[PDB]
Amino acid sequence: HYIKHPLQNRWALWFFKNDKSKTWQANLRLISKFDTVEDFWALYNHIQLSSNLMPGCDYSLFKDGIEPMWEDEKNKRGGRWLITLNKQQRRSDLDRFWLETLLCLIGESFDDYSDDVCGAVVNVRAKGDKIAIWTTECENRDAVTHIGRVYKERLGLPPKIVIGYQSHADTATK
Amino acid sequence: TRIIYDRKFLMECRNSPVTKTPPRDLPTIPGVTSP
Ligand SMILES: C[n+]1cn([C@@H]2O[C@H](COP(=O)(O)OP(=O)(O)OP(=O)(O)O)[C@@H](O)[C@H]2O)c2nc(N)[nH]c(=O)c21
């Protein structure tokens, strides 16, 4: 006897399996979709912590209909607010920051500019784990700025962890 | 108008009884999911 609380958006959780035989897109896999708070927690409570993913693997949470790749119409001209962690920060902060990121997404924490958010991505990597929020238009400087500011506040980033914005066009070049 | 939730409320919902059952068609991905 419970009424679930609906989210503004329906979301999809993706997993990326590091298989070097296969193409990047072919390693991408849909786990599940949800559109209530309680379904979010039901999913979260039955998946692995990011810090325990195999090296080279990712989680992505994206709005329904947006694939977690540069090529998607909604990401093409977009970009990301990115933080990179070192090795001790995997243990102490990765899982905390990822969950905080997820709550920013589903809770629509960026006011009107929440419509500019496409999703978020966590990359578990030997060289240093990465968390990012993907936004739809790198040129919407107001949206980008506000999202970045609020996101940095909600994460509670210490100054030793810098947060930076880059367009996917530049990433896909380098 | 937009449905917005702050952190404290989202966290309180985690205790709900509906969050203790996995999603119905959760796939089997050993090490990643617990269906
Ligand atoms: C997010 N993304 C990652 N890849 C591929 O996987 C590679 C690794 O990208 P990465 O996001 O996994 O970073 P990584 O830490 O592994 O290494 P880095 O490039 O030095 O930062 C990319 O260079 C692409 O070949 C991608 N390839 C395509 N076609 N589209 C994407 O959106 C995409």
Side-chain angles (χ1 to χ4, degrees), chain A residues 24 68-71 123 125 130 134:
Chain A
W24 183 91
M69 55 181 70
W70 305 323
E71 293 91 342
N123 303 125
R125 298 297 182 275
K130 294 174 275 181
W134 285 30

Side-chain angles (χ1 to χ4, degrees), chain B residues 7-27:
Chain B
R7 178 180 194 286
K8 178 171 180 52
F9 180 79
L10 292 177
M11 291 302 201
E12 309 264 15
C13 287
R14 187 181 189 183
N15 292 295
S16 173
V18 295
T19 75
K20 298 131 75 172
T21 299
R24 66 167 172 185
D25 280 344
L26 194 68

Side-chain angles (χ1 to χ4, degrees), chain A residues 6 41 45-46 48 100 115, chain B residues 2 5 7 10 14 32 34:
Chain A
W41 285 116
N45 287 340
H46 295 87
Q48 184 63 258
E100 220 58 59
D115 287 344
Chain B
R2 199 178 309 274
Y5 296 112
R7 178 180 194 286
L10 292 177
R14 187 181 189 183
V32 177
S34 301

Side-chain angles (χ1 to χ4, degrees), chain A residues 115-130:
Chain A
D115 287 344
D116 263 49
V117 167
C118 300
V121 181
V122 56
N123 303 125
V124 181
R125 298 297 182 275
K127 300 184 82 65
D129 301 320
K130 294 174 275 181

